[PDB]
Amino acid sequence: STGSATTTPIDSLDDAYITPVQIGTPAQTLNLDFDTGSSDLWVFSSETTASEVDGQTIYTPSKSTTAKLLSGATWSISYGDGSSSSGDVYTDTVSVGGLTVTGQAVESAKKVSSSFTEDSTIDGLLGLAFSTLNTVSPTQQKTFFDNAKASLDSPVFTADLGYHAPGTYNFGFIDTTAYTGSITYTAVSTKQGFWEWTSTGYAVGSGTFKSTSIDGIADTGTTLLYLPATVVSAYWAQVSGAKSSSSVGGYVFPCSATLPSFTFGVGSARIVIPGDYIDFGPISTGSSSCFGGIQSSAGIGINIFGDVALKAAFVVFNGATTPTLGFASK
């Protein structure tokens, strides 16, 4: 089998992407944030504290003839941005772009933190990291991809995120019309539960390529590109007036700037992030100070190849017995 679904930016900055997901019978369609950096499929629901729901579409398990309470199971997750959610668990039928999994754990939120409430466009998350990170207790549950894998034509999914435009998540096949040149594959460590890999270096604008190993995670659920402070300083030093602002919480730059591109290495191959992808707009409405899309990972504890990086590529998440990651230009 295969599936193919369009993923759409939630706003004009590409802060996140939502993908429609069918849950239950009859289908209840929710727009979920596909997150290769976590491993829980959780949704706003009829069980969510009413004051914490503000415009989201909710899953109502009592209206699904295929929903079953997973007795005794609870979940609770905290994300890198300090947000969190928790609740109980149902199993139900879940379909993405025509690909159907029966008995998928659907984690129903009883509580969500303010950042989730405040974002009306995201109805929950669909985790696509390794199932070892799944938070369901006392019986850990599998991701949608893990459950679908054996049925797929090939044990892969691909992320093709757009810049200020829709893109595509495919399951079970590689669309050879969706990228240019060849796909370069690179080794993955699953030891931390992430799609963790090592970039071979970087360049800033038209500058020379610096060969250096940068361990990090491919994370569709993180907006920005988080890299070591040395790398980030080298980038922003090429933008007149750019500075790190402790008050704002990262590098800012004059909105009048033209940003240089940023290149990262995948083996001997190179992915170029155009300068415009690195502009996240005014820090506050009407400001002439703009927020940068490349930020320091210092104090995160890990480098994160988030959407800024991934949307410059066609990315293969190869879930074969030994997982790997592939990157192509597009």
Coordinates of C-alpha atoms in Angstrom, one line a residue:
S1 CA 0.0 0.0 0.0
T2 CA 0.9 3.7 -0.2
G3 CA -0.5 7.0 1.0
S4 CA 0.0 10.6 -0.2
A5 CA -1.3 13.7 1.5
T6 CA -0.8 17.4 1.0
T7 CA 0.7 19.4 3.8
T8 CA -0.1 23.1 4.1
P9 CA 1.6 26.0 6.0
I10 CA -0.5 27.3 8.9
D11 CA 0.5 30.9 8.3
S12 CA 2.5 33.2 6.0
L13 CA 5.8 32.4 7.8
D14 CA 5.6 28.6 7.5
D15 CA 5.6 28.4 11.3
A16 CA 4.3 24.8 11.0
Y17 CA 2.5 22.6 8.4
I18 CA -0.8 20.8 8.8
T19 CA -1.9 17.6 7.1
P20 CA -5.5 16.3 7.1
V21 CA -5.9 12.9 8.9
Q22 CA -9.1 10.8 8.9
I23 CA -9.9 9.3 12.4
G24 CA -12.7 6.9 13.2
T25 CA -15.9 5.7 11.5
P26 CA -17.5 7.7 10.0
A27 CA -14.3 9.7 9.4
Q28 CA -13.5 12.7 11.5
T29 CA -10.9 14.8 9.7
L30 CA -8.4 16.7 11.9
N31 CA -5.5 18.7 10.7
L32 CA -2.4 17.4 12.4
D33 CA 1.2 18.6 12.7
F34 CA 3.3 15.7 11.4
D35 CA 6.3 15.7 13.7
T36 CA 9.4 13.6 12.9
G37 CA 10.8 14.7 16.3
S38 CA 8.2 13.0 18.5
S39 CA 6.2 9.7 18.6
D40 CA 2.7 10.4 19.9
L41 CA -0.4 10.8 17.8
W42 CA -2.5 13.1 20.0
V43 CA -5.6 15.1 19.3
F44 CA -7.9 17.8 20.7
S45 CA -11.0 15.9 21.7
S46 CA -14.4 16.0 23.3
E47 CA -12.4 15.2 26.5
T48 CA -10.2 18.4 26.3
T49 CA -10.9 20.9 29.1
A50 CA -13.3 23.3 27.5
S51 CA -11.4 26.5 28.4
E52 CA -8.4 25.1 26.6
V53 CA -10.1 24.6 23.2
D54 CA -10.3 27.7 21.0
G55 CA -11.2 27.0 17.4
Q56 CA -9.6 23.5 17.0
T57 CA -11.5 20.7 15.4
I58 CA -12.0 17.9 18.0
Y59 CA -12.1 14.1 17.8
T60 CA -15.2 12.7 19.5
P61 CA -14.6 9.0 20.2
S62 CA -18.2 8.3 21.3
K63 CA -19.2 9.2 17.7
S64 CA -16.9 6.6 16.2
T65 CA -18.1 3.0 15.9
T66 CA -14.5 1.8 15.7
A67 CA -13.2 3.7 18.7
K68 CA -12.2 1.6 21.7
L69 CA -10.9 2.9 25.0
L70 CA -7.4 1.5 25.7
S71 CA -8.2 0.7 29.3
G72 CA -5.8 2.2 31.9
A73 CA -3.6 3.9 29.3
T74 CA -2.5 7.5 29.8
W75 CA 0.0 9.8 28.1
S76 CA 1.8 13.0 28.9
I77 CA 4.3 14.8 26.8
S78 CA 6.5 17.9 27.0
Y79 CA 8.1 19.4 23.9
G80 CA 11.3 21.4 23.3
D81 CA 9.5 24.7 23.2
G82 CA 8.1 24.1 26.7
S83 CA 4.6 23.2 25.5
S84 CA 2.8 20.1 26.8
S85 CA -0.4 18.0 26.7
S86 CA -1.8 14.9 28.3
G87 CA -4.8 12.6 28.4
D88 CA -6.1 9.1 27.9
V89 CA -6.0 6.7 24.9
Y90 CA -8.3 5.1 22.3
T91 CA -7.6 2.8 19.5
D92 CA -9.3 3.7 16.2
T93 CA -8.9 3.6 12.4
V94 CA -6.6 6.3 11.1
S95 CA -6.0 7.1 7.5
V96 CA -3.5 9.5 5.9
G97 CA -3.8 10.2 2.2
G98 CA -5.5 6.9 1.4
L99 CA -3.3 4.8 3.7
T100 CA -5.3 3.1 6.5
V101 CA -4.1 1.7 9.9
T102 CA -6.6 -0.1 12.1
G103 CA -6.0 -0.2 15.8
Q104 CA -3.9 3.0 15.9
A105 CA -3.4 4.5 19.3
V106 CA -5.1 7.9 19.2
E107 CA -4.2 9.9 22.3
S108 CA -7.0 12.1 23.4
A109 CA -6.0 15.3 25.2
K110 CA -7.6 16.1 28.5
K111 CA -5.2 19.0 29.0
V112 CA -3.1 21.1 26.6
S113 CA -0.8 24.0 27.4
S114 CA -1.5 27.6 26.3
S115 CA 0.6 27.5 23.1
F116 CA -1.7 24.7 21.7
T117 CA -4.9 26.5 22.8
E118 CA -3.7 29.7 21.2
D119 CA -3.1 28.0 17.8
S120 CA -6.5 27.4 16.3
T121 CA -5.0 25.8 13.1
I122 CA -3.4 22.7 14.7
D123 CA -5.8 20.0 15.9
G124 CA -3.0 17.7 17.3
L125 CA 0.3 16.0 16.4
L126 CA 1.2 12.9 14.5
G127 CA 4.5 11.7 15.6
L128 CA 6.9 10.1 13.1
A129 CA 10.1 9.6 15.3
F130 CA 10.8 6.1 16.6
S131 CA 8.2 4.4 18.8
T132 CA 10.7 4.1 21.6
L133 CA 9.8 7.8 22.4
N134 CA 6.1 7.2 22.7
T135 CA 4.8 8.3 26.0
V136 CA 1.8 6.0 26.6
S137 CA 1.9 4.2 29.9
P138 CA 1.9 1.5 31.1
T139 CA 2.0 0.0 27.5
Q140 CA 4.0 2.0 25.0
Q141 CA 2.2 2.4 21.7
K142 CA 3.5 2.4 18.1
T143 CA 3.5 5.4 15.7
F144 CA 1.3 5.5 12.6
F145 CA 4.4 4.8 10.4
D146 CA 5.5 1.8 12.6
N147 CA 2.0 0.3 12.4
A148 CA 1.8 0.9 8.6
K149 CA 5.3 -0.2 7.7
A150 CA 4.8 -3.9 7.0
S151 CA 1.9 -3.1 4.6
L152 CA 3.8 -0.4 2.7
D153 CA 5.2 -1.1 -0.8
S154 CA 8.6 0.2 0.6
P155 CA 9.2 0.9 4.3
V156 CA 9.7 4.7 3.9
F157 CA 8.0 8.0 4.1
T158 CA 9.1 11.3 2.5
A159 CA 8.7 14.9 3.5
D160 CA 8.5 17.5 0.7
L161 CA 7.7 20.7 2.5
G162 CA 7.0 23.9 0.6
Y163 CA 8.4 27.4 1.0
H164 CA 5.3 29.6 1.5
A165 CA 3.4 26.9 -0.4
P166 CA 1.8 23.4 0.1
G167 CA 3.9 20.3 -0.1
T168 CA 3.5 16.6 0.4
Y169 CA 4.0 13.7 2.8
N170 CA 4.2 10.3 1.0
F171 CA 4.1 6.9 2.6
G172 CA 5.5 3.7 1.0
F173 CA 7.1 5.1 -2.2
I174 CA 9.6 7.6 -3.5
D175 CA 8.2 10.0 -6.1
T176 CA 11.1 10.3 -8.5
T177 CA 9.4 13.3 -10.1
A178 CA 9.6 15.3 -6.9
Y179 CA 13.3 16.1 -6.8
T180 CA 16.2 16.9 -9.0
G181 CA 19.5 15.0 -9.4
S182 CA 20.0 12.0 -7.0
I183 CA 19.1 11.3 -3.4
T184 CA 22.1 11.1 -1.1
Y185 CA 21.6 8.7 1.8
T186 CA 23.3 9.1 5.2
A187 CA 23.5 7.0 8.4
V188 CA 21.0 7.4 11.2
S189 CA 21.4 6.7 14.9
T190 CA 18.2 5.7 16.6
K191 CA 19.8 5.7 20.1
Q192 CA 17.9 8.8 21.2
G193 CA 14.7 7.9 19.4
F194 CA 15.2 10.5 16.7
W195 CA 16.1 10.6 13.0
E196 CA 19.6 11.6 14.1
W197 CA 22.3 12.0 11.5
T198 CA 25.6 13.9 10.9
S199 CA 25.9 16.7 8.4
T200 CA 29.3 17.0 6.7
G201 CA 29.6 20.8 7.0
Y202 CA 28.3 24.1 5.9
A203 CA 28.8 27.3 3.8
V204 CA 27.5 30.8 4.1
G205 CA 26.3 32.5 0.9
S206 CA 28.9 32.1 -1.8
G207 CA 31.6 31.3 0.8
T208 CA 33.8 28.3 0.9
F209 CA 32.5 25.1 2.4
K210 CA 33.7 24.2 5.9
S211 CA 34.1 20.5 6.4
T212 CA 33.0 19.7 9.9
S213 CA 30.7 17.1 11.5
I214 CA 27.4 18.4 12.8
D215 CA 25.2 15.8 14.6
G216 CA 21.6 16.7 14.6
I217 CA 18.0 15.6 14.1
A218 CA 15.7 15.8 11.1
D219 CA 12.6 17.4 12.8
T220 CA 9.6 18.4 10.8
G221 CA 7.9 19.6 14.0
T222 CA 10.5 22.3 14.7
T223 CA 10.2 25.6 12.6
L224 CA 13.8 26.8 12.6
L225 CA 17.3 25.5 12.0
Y226 CA 19.3 25.2 15.3
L227 CA 23.0 24.8 14.9
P228 CA 26.2 25.3 17.1
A229 CA 26.9 28.8 18.1
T230 CA 30.1 29.0 16.0
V231 CA 28.2 28.2 12.8
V232 CA 25.3 30.5 13.6
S233 CA 27.7 33.4 14.4
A234 CA 29.5 32.8 11.1
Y235 CA 26.1 33.1 9.3
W236 CA 24.9 36.3 11.0
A237 CA 28.2 38.0 10.7
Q238 CA 27.4 38.3 7.0
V239 CA 24.3 40.3 7.6
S240 CA 24.9 44.0 8.4
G241 CA 23.2 44.9 11.6
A242 CA 22.4 41.4 12.7
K243 CA 22.8 40.6 16.4
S244 CA 21.8 38.2 19.1
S245 CA 19.2 39.7 21.3
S246 CA 18.7 38.1 24.8
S247 CA 15.5 40.1 25.2
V248 CA 14.0 38.8 21.9
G249 CA 15.4 35.3 22.4
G250 CA 17.8 34.9 19.4
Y251 CA 19.4 36.5 16.4
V252 CA 17.5 39.4 14.8
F253 CA 18.4 41.4 11.8
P254 CA 17.2 44.5 10.0
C255 CA 14.1 43.8 8.0
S256 CA 15.7 45.8 5.1
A257 CA 18.5 43.2 4.7
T258 CA 18.9 40.7 1.9
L259 CA 19.9 37.4 3.5
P260 CA 22.6 35.1 2.2
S261 CA 21.9 31.5 1.6
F262 CA 23.1 28.7 3.9
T263 CA 24.4 25.4 2.6
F264 CA 24.6 22.2 4.6
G265 CA 26.4 19.0 3.6
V266 CA 24.9 15.5 3.2
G267 CA 27.8 13.3 2.5
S268 CA 29.5 14.8 -0.5
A269 CA 26.2 16.4 -1.6
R270 CA 25.0 19.9 -0.7
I271 CA 21.6 21.3 0.1
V272 CA 21.2 25.1 -0.4
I273 CA 18.7 27.0 1.8
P274 CA 17.9 30.3 0.0
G275 CA 18.3 33.4 2.0
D276 CA 14.6 34.2 1.9
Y277 CA 13.8 30.9 3.8
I278 CA 15.7 32.3 6.8
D279 CA 13.5 35.4 7.2
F280 CA 10.8 35.0 9.9
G281 CA 9.6 38.6 9.7
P282 CA 9.1 41.4 12.3
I283 CA 9.7 40.4 15.9
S284 CA 6.4 42.2 16.7
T285 CA 3.8 43.8 14.4
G286 CA 5.3 46.8 12.6
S287 CA 8.8 46.4 13.9
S288 CA 11.8 46.8 11.5
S289 CA 13.7 44.2 13.5
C290 CA 13.2 40.7 11.9
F291 CA 13.7 37.3 13.5
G292 CA 16.2 34.9 12.0
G293 CA 15.6 31.4 10.8
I294 CA 19.0 30.1 11.9
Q295 CA 19.5 30.1 15.6
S296 CA 21.9 28.7 18.2
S297 CA 21.3 25.2 19.6
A298 CA 23.5 26.1 22.6
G299 CA 21.5 25.0 25.7
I300 CA 19.1 22.8 23.7
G301 CA 21.5 19.9 23.9
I302 CA 21.0 18.9 20.3
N303 CA 21.2 20.5 16.8
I304 CA 17.9 20.5 15.0
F305 CA 17.4 20.4 11.2
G306 CA 13.9 21.9 11.4
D307 CA 11.6 23.1 8.6
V308 CA 14.0 25.9 7.5
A309 CA 16.4 23.2 6.4
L310 CA 14.1 20.4 5.5
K311 CA 11.9 22.5 3.2
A312 CA 15.0 23.1 0.9
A313 CA 15.1 19.4 0.2
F314 CA 13.2 16.3 -0.7
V315 CA 13.8 14.1 2.4
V316 CA 13.5 10.3 2.7
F317 CA 12.9 8.8 6.0
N318 CA 13.9 5.2 5.3
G319 CA 12.5 2.9 8.0
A320 CA 14.3 -0.3 6.8
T321 CA 15.8 -2.6 9.3
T322 CA 18.8 -0.3 9.5
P323 CA 17.2 3.2 9.1
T324 CA 18.8 5.9 7.0
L325 CA 17.9 9.4 5.8
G326 CA 18.0 10.6 2.2
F327 CA 18.3 14.2 0.9
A328 CA 17.8 15.5 -2.6
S329 CA 17.6 19.0 -4.0
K330 CA 14.3 20.0 -5.7

